[PDB]
Amino acid sequence: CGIVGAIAQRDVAEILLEGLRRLEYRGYDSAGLAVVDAEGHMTRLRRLGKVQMLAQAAEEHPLHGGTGIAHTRWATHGEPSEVNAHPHVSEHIVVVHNGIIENHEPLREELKARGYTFVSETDTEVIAHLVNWELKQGGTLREAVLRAIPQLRGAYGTVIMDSRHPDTLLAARSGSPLVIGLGMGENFIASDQLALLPVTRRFIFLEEGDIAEITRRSVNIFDKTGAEVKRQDIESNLQ
Amino acid sequence: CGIVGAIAQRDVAEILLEGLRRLEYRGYDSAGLAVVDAEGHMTRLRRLGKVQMLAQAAEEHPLHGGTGIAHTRWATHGEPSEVNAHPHVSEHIVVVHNGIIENHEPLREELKARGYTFVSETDTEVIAHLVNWELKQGGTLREAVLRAIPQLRGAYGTVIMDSRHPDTLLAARSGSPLVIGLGMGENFIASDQLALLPVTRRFIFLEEGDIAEITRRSVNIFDKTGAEVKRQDIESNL
Ligand SMILES: N[C@@H](CCC(=O)NO)C(=O)O
Ligand SMILES: N[C@@H](CCC(=O)NO)C(=O)O
Ligand code: NA
Numbered sequence: 001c002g003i004v005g006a007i008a009q010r011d012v013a014e015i016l017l018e019g020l021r022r023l024e025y026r027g028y029d030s031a032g033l034a035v036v037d038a039e040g041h042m043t044r045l046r047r048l049g050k051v052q053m054l055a056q057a058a059e060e061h062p063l064h065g066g067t068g069i070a071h072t073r074w075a076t077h078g079e080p081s082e083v084n085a086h087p088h089v090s091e092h093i094v095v096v097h098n099g100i101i102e103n104h105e106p107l108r109e110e111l112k113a114r115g116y117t118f119v120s121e122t123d124t125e126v127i128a129h130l131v132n133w134e135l136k137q138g139g140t141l142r143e144a145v146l147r148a149i150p151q152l153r154g155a156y157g158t159v160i161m162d163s164r165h166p167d168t169l170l171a172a173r174s175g176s177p178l179v180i181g182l183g184m185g186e187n188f189i190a191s192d193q194l195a196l197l198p199v200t201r202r203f204i205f206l207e208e209g210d211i212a213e214i215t216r217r218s219v220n221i222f223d224k225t226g227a228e229v230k231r232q233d234i235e236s237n238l239q
Numbered sequence: 240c241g242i243v244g245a246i247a248q249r250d251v252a253e254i255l256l257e258g259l260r261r262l263e264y265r266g267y268d269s270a271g272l273a274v275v276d277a278e279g280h281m282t283r284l285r286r287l288g289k290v291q292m293l294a295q296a297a298e299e300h301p302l303h304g305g306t307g308i309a310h311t312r313w314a315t316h317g318e319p320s321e322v323n324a325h326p327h328v329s330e331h332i333v334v335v336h337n338g339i340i341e342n343h344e345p346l347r348e349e350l351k352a353r354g355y356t357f358v359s360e361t362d363t364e365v366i367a368h369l370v371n372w373e374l375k376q377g378g379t380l381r382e383a384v385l386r387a388i389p390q391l392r393g394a395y396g397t398v399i400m401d402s403r404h405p406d407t408l409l410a411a412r413s414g415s416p417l418v419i420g421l422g423m424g425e426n427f428i429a430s431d432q433l434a435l436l437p438v439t440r441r442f443i444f445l446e447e448g449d450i451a452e453i454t455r456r457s458v459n460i461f462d463k464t465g466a467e468v469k470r471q472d473i474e475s476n477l
């Protein structure tokens with residue numbers, strides 16, 4: 001339901017939690033976040049329940065790290081439970097996802113043959129394992145995600161990270177909104193500009209089919225053929 | 240002329256440089272910045288000339304540190320020169336200043352008599368040595384500033400840091416504008432909100448006579464008798 005992600009020099013957990021607070025009004029059954037520090041140490045915290053519960057859990061875990069993604073979930077596939085909450089993982093691959101992967105069944109079956117254990121009942125978990133799978137075939141996270149995305153069917157928005165290389169976030173808009181917020185030496189992404197207003201007012205709205213590679217210093221957006229596309233940033237007048 | 244300051248977890252040099260760029264339209268002859276990392280290592284860079292010259296020098300010096308102050312100067316006391324540019328230092332005390340300290344002469348002699356060496360011809364440098372002096376007498380940087388400000392006469396604003404304790408900036412508004420920018424786990428200060436728009440839109444204007452102690456997580460504002468005052472934060476997108 002709500003996605004927020006950030007890639008910064010400063011710790012981003014508090015920014016992710018504030019963004020999720022801003023996305024609650026939409027409604028949801030659970031929420032989670034994962035942050036990775038510069039050494040690739042990932043901390044993931046999820047809760048069945050409200051962001052406030054997640055925030056209270058985070059208070060006893062000071063999550064350090066400048067790369068992170070967070071999500072509030074309105075369950076479609078798999079009952080609300082902590083196991084099914086996002087972020088989902090596949091070793092170092094961590095994903096948050098809005099929407100539905102229509103063809104999750106056949107995909108889940110392939111990945112099971114490839115030796116992947118599904119721990120959740122979500123369609124989402126297929127994204128994580130599949131990117132893990134593609135990445136094993138060689139190349140950067142961007143290249144792996146360019147191969148993964150066309151295999152996915154449905155109306156979805158996803159942000160992916162590799163905890164081993166916390167310097168890049170990949171995001172793909174494919175039926176669900178995502179917008180990039182531009183910072184000074186940091187960048188953010190959310191499913192709604194409203195989440196990011198406390199830290200930036202300058203946005204790039206991704207378009208349908210866009211895949212964005214986001215680092216602290218650059219945003220590069222591509223279509224599914226790997227062609228670079230140019231998207232304009234705009235200043236938001238909202239408060 | 241322009242002051243920008245920041246206290247953050249992330250490196251702030253680029254934010255300071257961009258704030259100075261946003262203050263150039265006012266005019267100036269020199270500019271400088273100082274940043275301190277968590278271990279109290281201070282890097283100070285100043286240039287006679289344009290902010291671009293400073294930004295170019297900074298690119299060969301990548302300045303690390305989450306606490307910093309920066310300034311564009313329009314010379315009033317002491318000709319434009321790198322020596323007279325701010326920030327000025329007195330060992331670990333680092334200062335930027337807008338305005339004029341009208342009683343700088345009596346204070347300079349007083350601090351010379353007290354053993355300080357003035358390297359610059361500015362009135363500004365007296366602030367740095369005066370705070371350093373008061374701090375020697377004991378107490379926190381806020382307490383020292385509280386004692387120092389009443390000794391100064393003039394229309395001025397200043398932001399002060401102690402590289403030994405990079406977790407706090409002190410600012411005093413005494414006839415020249417200063418505004419605090421509120422961030423998330425970081426805070427900023429500038430002589431003009433225009434400087435800070437890239438990083439925040441929420442501001443607290445300091446009022447005349449206010450002394451603010453700013454950390455990454457809190458802003459505490461006091462008057463000269465040391466009473467805590469409450470100032471309202473405003474959202475302001477220009
Ligand atoms: N299908 C995924 C995501 C549902 C969601 O939150 N959409 O906004 C799930 O059930 O977890
Ligand atoms: N009097 C100080 C600061 C002058 C000023 O405000 N310039 O804009 C000096 O001469 O350095
Ligand atoms: Na789609």
Ligand code: NA
Nearest residue numbers: 393394413414
């Ligand atoms: Na004054």
